[PDB]
RNA sequence: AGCAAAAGCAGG
């Protein structure tokens, strides 16, 4: 039923030496093969053609980290200095609304000088936060001491709120011909950031995050019974998977990170027009004694009407620490530092008496994130999956299929560290450990530099593979892999460190 | 001490730890911004690319639309999308010599199924594009607007009820002059396609801005799609149809065949890659010559039918998305500008690229929706251009190339991999650059980047890595692994139904697969607080658990929403969960859950009240 | 609380509260409590009927397979 | 209510004792007000410190 | 101020 409007389209969309649909279609009815192709390739221009090259040993560069200023941390939650207060070991029948067994472990400790910043943030106005944490412990302490004990508290409007998230920052809808007569407008400062040097901060935090902390940090249940044969490999290895994992300090950020982005949404879905304190809550259980809320840190939820999942909301995080600034100021340009008195530590011999500070940071995250960073327990799950996969490849080159090979084996036979003249070798324990850490940190610097990164530099090591196996490996154009990866390299620490990395690699490998 | 991970990947294969390097355990970047940026960008990329190809405008749109096809030679080894179509046909002609019978069946297939076919399947999509209100929404609504609108036209096909009927009287209509809007304009708003920036899309920087059709056009390529899942069914080389672990072993089956080197005096090099402007370079004319090749010696009628999809790919004029929201500096107010009037405004307000890109496309503007028809759209499940692209492959078989060396392999969407031979690196050097001309005669365009070449035994293909006979797959990321949140009854069963389908169809390992279940109770108990009976942990259900767990007689035989423990494991995972726990129940619980007094019906289903 | 929705129809069969007294239906049929569902459970008709394996005995048939 | 939430082990109220003056079942009542009183002030409120 | 990026949020 063409109508024959529709025969006019086709016949305009034909190419130029047919005009009609029934000469076109007559044409490839009556088509025959003669051998166009070899006429159609020696009339051809030979600069049209796709040269290999042999793609040699000494010929991949080091990769060029970018120059710039240093690279910041931009996490929303440190990750080596932050500390916790216990609760030591509540029952097990009582439950908690949070804040109660926050205010209880910040009421457990004391040590609070008078509030003084530590580190000049450069930018913004120090003293307003400082101001900020002041209402924070004053809403507390007058909250709890002399009210109905209200199950969730959102702080009052202030000064130092209201500037620390800008509820006057937004501008207004308006419509183009009122607008159109002024000539301030432009579309977007919509341009590449600054540009980042790597530097040896976040190869300290990343060291301090794979290694163990002594708690258990999450308990694991039962399930049916095991009969068939795959039922019980699949048991020895979460078993394994599970223990050796349950001691890390990435499974510590695990944990919190869902708390608090579960937290944060609930509040977010929940309420929207009110400045909520919201703790860093996590619940781990002792090796050895009961269940234990620990208190990293307190929150100031900023207000988060989210009309679209994509949109950011902006808030301010409290988060204690023992370690002094100055030290590396570079690591944050960011943070507001205060001073909050000492804490009294306990070493062996004697006593530490160091002083305790603050870092009253702002900060933003999203609806997405939240959801991404509440979905952390499938990253350990897909740590899980890394590992069967290297497992499963090394069962199908040797028909042992043993996991008990090298889940257990005292066999050094996995290289994870670089020495100075030297490479460290380690067990499955810490290697597991360090993949776990990787994608919590995926998960956590998550941005597209590092997908760029990952897509190029897998291309890159793929084809050294192939050559340090002696498969003659070739490729066409280098020098636009090597552009896109340092196009991808804009500023991200982590993506930054992935790349030293791949370059001490190339190097100690030789290729 | 320092560490890294990158030399416990020094040693180790790659293939096998390649997964450290899908970092994909965290959310996607996706684009806060309005992707008509880059959809300009991608525009003015295509239409760069056939810059020497000539265009005519089209009647009735006043569009300048591109066709490529009988352009000149490229010049130089930059891509660009100029092809010939007697390449075309001349490979479907080895192709139909090769397999014989091959295209008359799947022509018949085609019959029976458009004869079968009802308008009833189509309507269970996901966000085609309604013309009324000009945005992107849901099907349902969509195949409702569309029989409203048809029963307020003069036509009665949505009364019929078959489809092919519908999509003809679709056609008379759409050829109507009015309905309230005009021809001109009704053929611009019919031919319209979202813009839509790609979300979720892992392993890039810059977006690639997904475009996506409409309802009326989308039952032409149903039925062109159906007939390539047919032929490509019949075919051997196809990637996509095929899946699973049939897949798997097609991929191990085709480097078998190939590598396999009888009188191996010759080297042999078998590349990989991924053919870059796939969506771009490629066109529907060479669509439309394929299709009229394909079905030979069949009903006219059906000729037509299976033609009209690649002429409205042939010319359309996909929207540019929202706009842009300018914003001034001193005085601190912004407003959003709607790109309809960008044909219309001055070039000083932009970014310097972005007002370079305007100048770029300005011309190229009409009724403000940029047109083009050089290029396919972005991110369909064509499928024929498979059917395309493996004819090349299809060409080095020995009788063909007619030459010493010859290909060979699979090529899905984008990926491909070929296999070679030939008596030395300078022969094979001599084929592959042959192929890679050839290849480009036809108007497809490896990349020379992100590509490479290797001996045989090593090489990528849609991320199914196949090292020397280990085939690991990443094709995609395990999903949430928590509950869908409906009822107690059915939202374990739908959870160990996902398990049970991503271990079977995907690389779920079952190490894995057991944690996922073990999570997936935690989620669920800690969800309707209800753990199991014999705890310590408090809530407000505990009560009633720790009161029926006593009163039971036999105890782990409960089901788990109350109080009960979880028999479930990777051997029993299809079966629902009560016909494990049956029998090991006692009749007073069991005749307390099967009971039609129930206002549940299942005792544990029911209805949420909405919020 | 009350995610549950059910009809008025259970409002005979079962009380306000338990013995703990906390609710399982109120109304604004009835919203019902999921410790409703546990308190059925609990006390409610037995009967040793043997319809509704009308066509869940065929799962059985299943696991005897394995078993 | 923590300590009164610890203990499982509650049949209906029945009363075992006749009084023999005033009226047994509504001391019953009372109690039974009690319970309720006291659950739903605690799991649906906003924390009372006396009731 | 911040988040984060070759464009947006910082409430409507």
Same mark, same amino acid.
């Given at each position: ?285 002792? !090796?050895?004694?009961?269940? !234990? ?8 939820? /900023? ?41 009294? *530590? ?11 500070? *603050? ?57 994870? /560290? ?10 499955? /324990? ?40 002696? *498969? ?40 | ?152 036209? +003069? ?120 053919? %870059? ?68 405004? $001055? ?41 395309? +692209? ?116 995907? $690389?779920?390992?079952?190490? %894995? ?99 | ?67």
């Amino acid at each position: 039923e063409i109508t024959g409007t529709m025969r006019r389209l086709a016949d305009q969309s034909l190419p130029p030496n047919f005009s009609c649909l029934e000469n076109f279609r007559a044409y490839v009815d009556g088509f025959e093969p003669n051998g166009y192709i070899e006429g159609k390739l020696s009339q051809m221009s030979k600069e049209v053609n796709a040269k290999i090259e042999p793609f040699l040993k000494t010929t991949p560069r080091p990769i060029r980290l970018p120059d710039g200023p240093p690279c910041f941390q931009r996490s929303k939650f440190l990750l080596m200095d932050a500390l916790k207060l216990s609760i030591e070991d509540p029952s097990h029948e009582g439950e908690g609304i949070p804040l109660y067994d926050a205010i209880k472990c910040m009421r457990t400790f004391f040590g609070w000088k008078e509030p003084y910043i530590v580190k000049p943030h450069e930018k913004g106005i120090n003293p307003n936060y400082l101001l900020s944490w002041k209402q924070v412990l004053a809403e507390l302490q007058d909250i709890e001491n002399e009210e109905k004990i209200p199950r969730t508290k959102n702080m009052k409007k202030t000064s130092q709120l209201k500037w620390a998230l800008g509820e006057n920052m937004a501008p207004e809808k308006v419509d183009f011909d009122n607008c159109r007569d002024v000539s301030d407008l432009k579309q977007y400062d919509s341009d590449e950031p600054e540009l980042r040097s790597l530097s040896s901060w976040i190869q300290n935090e990343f060291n301090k995050a794979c290694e163990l902390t002594d708690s258990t940090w999450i308990e694991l249940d039962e399930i049916g019974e095991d009969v068939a044969p795959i039922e019980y490999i699949a048991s020895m290895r979460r078993n394994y998977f599970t223990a050796e994992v349950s001691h890390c300090r990435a499974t510590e950020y695990i944990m919190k990170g869902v708390y608090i982005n579960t937290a944060l949404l609930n509040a977010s879905c929940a309420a929207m027009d009110d400045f909520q304190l919201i703790p860093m809550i996590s619940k781990c259980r002792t !090796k050895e004694g009961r269940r !234990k809320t620990n208190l990293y840190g307190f929150i100031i939820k /900023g207000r988060s009407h989210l009309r679209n999942d994509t949109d950011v909301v902006n808030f301010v995080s409290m988060e204690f620490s023992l370690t002094d600034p100055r030290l590396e100021p570079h690591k944050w340009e960011k943070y507001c530092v205060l001073e909050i008195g000492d804490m009294l *530590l306990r070493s062996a011999i004697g006593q530490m008496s160091r002083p305790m500070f *603050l870092y009253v940071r702002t900060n933003g995250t999203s609806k997405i994130k939240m959801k991404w960073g509440m979905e952390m327990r499938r990253c350990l799950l897909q740590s899980l999956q890394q590992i069967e996969s290297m497992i499963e490849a090394e069962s199908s080159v040797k028909e042992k299929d043993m996991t008990k090979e090298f889940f257990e084996n005292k066999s050094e036979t996995w290289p994870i /560290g670089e020495s100075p003249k030297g490479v460290e070798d380690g067990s499955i /324990g810490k290697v597991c450990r360090t993949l776990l850490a990787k994608s919590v940190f995926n998960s956590l610097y998550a941005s597209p530099q590092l997908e760029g990164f990952s897509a190029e530099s897998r291309k890159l090591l793929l084809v050294v593979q192939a050559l340090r196996d002696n *498969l003659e490996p070739g490729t066409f154009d280098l020098e636009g892999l090597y552009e896109a990866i340092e196009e991808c390299l804009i500023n991200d620490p982590w993506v930054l460190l992935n790349a030293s990395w791949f370059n001490s690699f190339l190097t100690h490998a030789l290729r | 001490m320092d560490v890294n991970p990158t030399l416990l990947f020094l040693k180790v294969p790659a293939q096998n730890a390649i997964s450290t390097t899908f970092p994909y355990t965290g959310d996607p970047p996706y684009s806060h911004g309005t992707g008509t940026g880059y959809t300009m960008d991608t525009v003015n990329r295509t239409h760069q690319y056939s810059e020497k190809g000539k265009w005519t405008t089209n009647t009735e749109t006043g569009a300048p639309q591109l066709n490529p096809i009988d352009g000149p030679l490229p010049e130089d080894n930059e891509p660009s999308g100029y092809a010939q179509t007697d390449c075309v046909l001349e490979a479907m002609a080895f192709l139909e010599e090769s397999h014989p019978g091959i295209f008359e069946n799947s022509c018949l297939e085609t019959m029976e199924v458009v004869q079968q076919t009802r308008v009833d399947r189509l309507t269970q999509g996901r966000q085609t594009y309604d013309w009324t209100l000009n945005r992107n929404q849901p099907a349902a609504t969509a195949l409702a607007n569309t029989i409203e609108v048809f029963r307020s036209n +003069g036509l009665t096909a949505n009364e019929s009820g078959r489809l092919i009927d519908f999509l003809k009287d679709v056609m008379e209509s759409m050829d109507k002059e009015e309905m309230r809007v005009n021809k001109r304009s009704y053929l611009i708003r019919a031919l319209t396609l979202n813009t839509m920036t790609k979300d979720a899309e892992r392993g890039k920087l810059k977006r690639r801005a997904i475009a996506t059709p409409g309802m009326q056009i989308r039952g032409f390529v149903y039925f062109v799609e159906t007939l390539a899942r047919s032929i490509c069914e019949k075919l051997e080389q196809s990637g996509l149809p095929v899946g699973g672990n049939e897949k798997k072993a097609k991929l191990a089956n085709v480097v078998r065949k190939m590598m396999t080197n009888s009188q191996d005096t010759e080297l042999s090099f078998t590349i990989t890659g991924d053919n %870059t402007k796939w969506n771009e370079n490629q066109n529907p004319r060479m669509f439309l010559a394929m299709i009229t090749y394909i079905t030979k010696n069949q009903p006219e009628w059906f000729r037509n039918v299976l033609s009209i999809a690649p002429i409205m790919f042939s010319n359309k004029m996909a929207r540019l998305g929202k706009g842009y929201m300018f914003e001034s500096k001193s005085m601190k107010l912004r407003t959003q500008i709607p790109a309809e009037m960008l044909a219309s405004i $001055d070039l000083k307000y932009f970014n310097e690229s972005t007002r370079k890109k305007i100048e770029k496309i300005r011309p190229l503007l009409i009724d403000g929706t940029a047109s083009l028809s050089p290029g396919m759209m972005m991110g369909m499940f064509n499928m024929l251009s498979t059917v395309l +692209g493996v004819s090349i492959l299809n060409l080095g078989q020995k009788r063909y190339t007619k030459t010493t060396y010859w290909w060979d392999g699979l090529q899905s969407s984008d990926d491909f991999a070929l296999i070679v031979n030939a008596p030395n690196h300078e022969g094979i050097q001599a084929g592959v650059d042959r192929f890679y001309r050839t290849c480009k005669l036809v108007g497809i365009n490896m990349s020379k980047k992100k590509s490479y070449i290797n001996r045989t035994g090593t090489f990528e293909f849609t991320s199914f890595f196949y090292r020397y006979g280990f085939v690991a797959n990443f094709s995609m990321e395990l999903p949430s692994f928590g509950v869908s949140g409906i009822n107690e009854s059915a939202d374990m069963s739908i959870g160990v139904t996902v398990i049970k389908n991503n271990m079977i169809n995907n $690389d779920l390992g079952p190490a %894995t697969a057991q944690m996922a279940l073990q999570l997936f109770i935690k989620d669920y108990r800690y969800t309707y607080r209800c753990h199991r009976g014999d705890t310590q942990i408090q809530t407000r259900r505990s009560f009633e658990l720790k009161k029926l767990w006593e009163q039971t007689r036999s105890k782990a035989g409960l089901l788990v929403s109350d109080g009960g423990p979880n028999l479930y494991n990777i051997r029993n995972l299809h079966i629902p969960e009560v016909c494990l726990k049956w029998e090991l129940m006692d009749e007073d619980y069991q005749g307390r859950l099967c009971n039609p007094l129930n206002p549940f019906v299942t005792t544990h289903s029911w209805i949420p009240k909405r919020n | 609380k009350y995610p549950i929705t059910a009809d008025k129809r259970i409002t005979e069969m079962v009380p306000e509260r338990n013995e703990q007294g906390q609710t399982l239906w109120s109304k604004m049929r009835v919203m019902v409590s999921p410790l409703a569902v546990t308190w059925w459970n609990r006390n409610g008709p037995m009967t040793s009927t043997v319809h509704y394996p009308k066509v869940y005995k065929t799962y059985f048939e299943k696991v005897e397979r394995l078993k």
